[PDB]
Design a protein around this ligand. Structure first.
Ligand code: 90H
Ligand code: 90H
Ligand code: CL
Lengths: 305, 305
């Protein structure tokens, strides 16, 4: 029992982190086989970053201008190319610690672990959600760029996020490993704001199931609701619409607790309309939306990697 | 910017986890050099655990009765001994992945990372505090026993916790790596309850400093207080006394923000007396006490390992 925000074990990703330096700019890279992936703004000075022409800056660089270090060892760069907002440095040595891996573009509402890194060295690991407005609520300082986000499925590391920038409100934005941004953001130092965020309804329901599994049952009411009537009420409180796909994904938790998804929807509607009245659920005074249905099942079933 | 509950990177500990099986009992062990450390109740059946005589059960076991597995590889056991609540199995192979390490007994109020494991395989990592009542608020299922808690200091892993049991309220108890329990608990299935818990004051202050560093400053008032007057008020709200040692440990955050510890104490006193009035601090509606002063400095300075 107990329910905690839990990250994936980071060891398979720790073995892939390197430092990339171009002139006086240093940030983190991800070394898989004989390629190092890092944010393309490694090739800018401070002044370049207000309106950089990356294609123009990269034409003036050659392989030897990229200093890649794996702990104390320099890796010799033997090719370079830009893909969207990511630089790919081919190196003469394959990383012997490369795990089985995939590059995946995640959907808003999905969670992942971030391995925050500085100078190619791991600082810490924590769990994030891709927000509906395409930001993450991270913890990132200057030097963190090229830190990565990932999921593990048994032996396979699915890389989904590379860190690039901080937006107003101290939220974060970055790319998939093909260098395409999540959301409407660009890698330029100019005024950019996230859209209005929305609460990930399907994740709040998953967490109420987690609360029932742990014996926190006070908020269960005697009512059901229709999907249509639930969605009209959720809309008012800036909750995402709940779709039939979301109901189907909640099926395993529903089956395990014996509580129909639309009965839990009736309980969530009463919490939104009436509040929590100074009570907590799983130790929280606010409804939590950064646990997916799969995160709840993994943690409450002891899935390992 | 941003502030998150962050765990240590787990890779150095992931390379030490093994499975130990004695009869039909399986749990996790920690393999350092040529020794495997695990909870001594690996040698009990279900029925033994209501009132076990561990010395008696262990005299009837020999080396070959302990099945240790490191992934697919069986490690041959060549000696065994009991130290307090921990079994030590000597094996014929040194773990080539053994990090620089120490065994340390932590103090209440200190934090550590737990690597939750099942069948010798990592499931997840999260950050805990040793509560004043010698429990942790973990997430542990049947099969998690012998999961470990640790801190990292550059290259050195300080192991502080081995998991043994779950108490009422879904809190957790275990031993240091010398097999001595934290708190008054015993490894027997009998009625045991944690004492009344208390809030770790020095950690709440550390987190209010973290809030100021991140630009959440609404709760700062124009007052100071004396250590004596603060402690009389804290006592009422089941906060630990703040000692001069605690004030000295808060010195670096105090110096960085320019806010004297006793001025922050005046702000905390007003939050305890008046509440938060539906506002949040660093996104939380409750005062958080599981960040140490050192956790705040590491995260807000980007300390790496
Ligand atoms: C990253 O370049 C790094 O760590 N380099 C060593 C850095 C990470 C960033 C700094 C503070 N916390 C973080 O997450 N990223 C940047 O500095 C990016 C680079 C330049 C401007 N960057 C920003 O993050 C801007 N943000 C914006 O301009 C805004 F508003 F659009 F988001 C700030 C103002 C420096 C935070 C790039 C976008 C190329
Ligand atoms: C551990 O033995 C394991 O994982 N084995 C494979 C297991 C971990 C435990 C189960 C549920 N969540 C957990 O953290 N520990 C135990 O079963 C211990 C063993 C027997 C009784 N144990 C308990 O944790 C008891 N607790 C108590 O009796 C109490 F109240 F004192 F705490 C429960 C009731 C099974 C939870 C030992 C103490 C030897
Ligand atoms: Cl909260």
């Amino acid at each position: 029992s107990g329910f905690r925000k839990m990250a994936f074990p980071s060891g398979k990703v720790e073995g892939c982190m390197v430092q990339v330096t171009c002139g006086t700019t240093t940030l983190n890279g991800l070394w898989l086989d004989d390629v190092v992936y890092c944010p393309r703004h490694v090739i800018c000075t401070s002044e370049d970053m207000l309106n950089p022409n990356y294609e123009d800056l990269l034409i003036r660089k050659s392989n030897h201008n990229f200093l890649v270090q794996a702990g104390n060892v320099q890796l010799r760069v033997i090719g370079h190319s830009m893909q969207n907002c990511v630089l790919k440095l081919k190196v003469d040595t394959a990383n012997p610690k490369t795990p089985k891996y995939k590059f995946v573009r995640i959907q808003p509402g999905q969670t992942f672990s971030v391995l925050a890194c500085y100078n190619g060295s791991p600082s810490g690991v924590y769990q994030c959600a891709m927000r509906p407005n395409f930001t993450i609520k991270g913890s990132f300082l200057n030097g963190s760029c090229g830190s990565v986000g990932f999921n593990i499925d048994y032996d396979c590391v699915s890389f989904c996020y590379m860190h690039h920038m901080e937006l107003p409100t101290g939220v974060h934005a970055g790319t998939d490993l093909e260098g395409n941004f999540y959301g409407p953001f660009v890698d330029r130092q100019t005024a950019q704001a996230a859209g209005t965020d929305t609460t990930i309804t399907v994740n709040v329901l998953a967490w109420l199931y987690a609360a029932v599994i742990n014996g926190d049952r006070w908020f269960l009411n005697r009512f059901t609701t229709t999907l249509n009537d639930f969605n009209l009420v959720a809309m008012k409180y800036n909750y995402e619409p709940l779709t039939q796909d979301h109901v189907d994904i909640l099926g395993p938790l529903s089956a395990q607790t014996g509580i129909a998804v639309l009965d839990m929807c009736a309980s969530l509607k009463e919490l939104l309309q009436n509040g929590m009245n100074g009570r907590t659920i799983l130790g929280s005074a606010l409804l939590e939306d950064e646990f997916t249905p799969f995160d709840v099942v993994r943690q409450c079933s002891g899935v390992t990697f």
